[PDB]
Design a protein around this nucleic acid. Structure first.
Length: 97
DNA sequence: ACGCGCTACACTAAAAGGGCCCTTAATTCGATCGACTAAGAAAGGGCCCTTTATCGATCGACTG
């Protein structure tokens, strides 16, 4: 990732590995809450070309799961990791979300 | 092997998504204007009490 392992505690290293875990296991839902500036969104935005960081919380079942008009599957179809930032900000215009 | 079948453009209709925007029916309040709720009000009014008259009763000089 670019972190210095010798400058971190062992448990912090294992937490960072848990952060890797969503990339390596199929259909792995995981939630992480923490203080600002702890380097959360960096791994899901820079250090992987096959993961997406959904910003702003602007998520609808149309573009996230299945858009019935265009008949194309949403984000969850071609990305290995979908990371919802700003969990407070995520809200669904449709109820079914 | 040059006429022939495919591959490109506007109107009409249907679906769905997504702003979305108005609604509303929930909220706050926030005066507020009654609404009492005492606190002291003052007029008024009501109450009391010592005033004169008299009716004895008597106790007086005075008096014959």
């Amino acid at each position: 990732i670019g972190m210095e392992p010798a400058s971190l505690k062992e448990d912090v290293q294992w937490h960072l590995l848990a952060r890797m875990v969503p990339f390596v296991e199929n259909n792995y839902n995981v939630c992480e809450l923490g203080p600002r500036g702890t380097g959360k969104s960096h791994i899901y935005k820079e250090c992987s070309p096959n993961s997406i960081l959904v910003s702003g919380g602007q998520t609808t079942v149309a573009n996230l799961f299945y858009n019935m008009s265009s008949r194309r599957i949403g984000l969850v179809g071609l990305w290995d990791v979908v990371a919802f930032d700003q969990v407070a900000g995520i809200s669904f215009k449709d109820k079914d979300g």
